[PDB]
């Protein structure tokens, strides 16, 4: 999941079809259990500001359920599709945090999912 | 060239053809700037420990020049493809000390390689 979820994000990112998967169609119908305002606002303080830092913001939200880790997944790639990849983001800062709060649920994403 | 770095020692570690790019054929010709007997090493002790530990002190030494920066790439891609696919490692964790030591170099790699 740590490996699917770190190609998934960065594929958002760059849109590059030579690092396309067909195990992203099931990650990009997460989408949905994100609010399109919510990642308007995210995106709208890191360029405010000039950094990841609202995003690592973000991620550092207790996660309590599956529901919450896969919203979590939404975001970072929503916010990833929408920040363009001219952005210069450390994204292992941000896979740090996500995978700290979505670690335990990974086995049971996967069964979700998959 | 951070981007490209994870999607190439991803996918050293898994040998996933769906994963697979043919930006990596000049990036797995810095395997001769490597000893197999380090990686040998550094493997034993990864197993010995049942940690990621032995990896995250290699990183952490000095990077000097370019050539001390491509042994890096060279160590981690060759240490992701021996430990195997099932090593429950925390790659984020080994990008942020790479890239932390390599990140200068970048524009120049580019150059060399491409």
Redesign the interface.
């Given at each position: 999941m740590?490996?699917l979820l770190?190609?998934y994000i960065?594929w958002r990112?760059?849109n590059d079809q030579?690092?396309y998967?067909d195990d992203f169609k099931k990650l990009m119908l997460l989408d949905e259990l994100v609010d399109d305002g919510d990642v308007s606002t995210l995106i709208k303080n890191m360029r405010m500001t000039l950094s990841d830092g609202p995003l690592l913001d973000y991620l550092n939200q207790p996660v309590n359920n599956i529901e919450d880790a896969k919203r979590m997944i939404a975001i970072s790639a929503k916010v990833a599709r929408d920040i363009g990849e001219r952005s210069e983001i450390?994204?292992?800062?941000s896979?740090?945090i996500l995978?700290r709060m979505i670690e335990t649920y990974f086995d049971d994403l996967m069964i979700d999912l998959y």
């Open positions: 740590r490996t770190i190609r960065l990112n760059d030579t690092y998967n450390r994204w292992e800062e896979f740090t995978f």
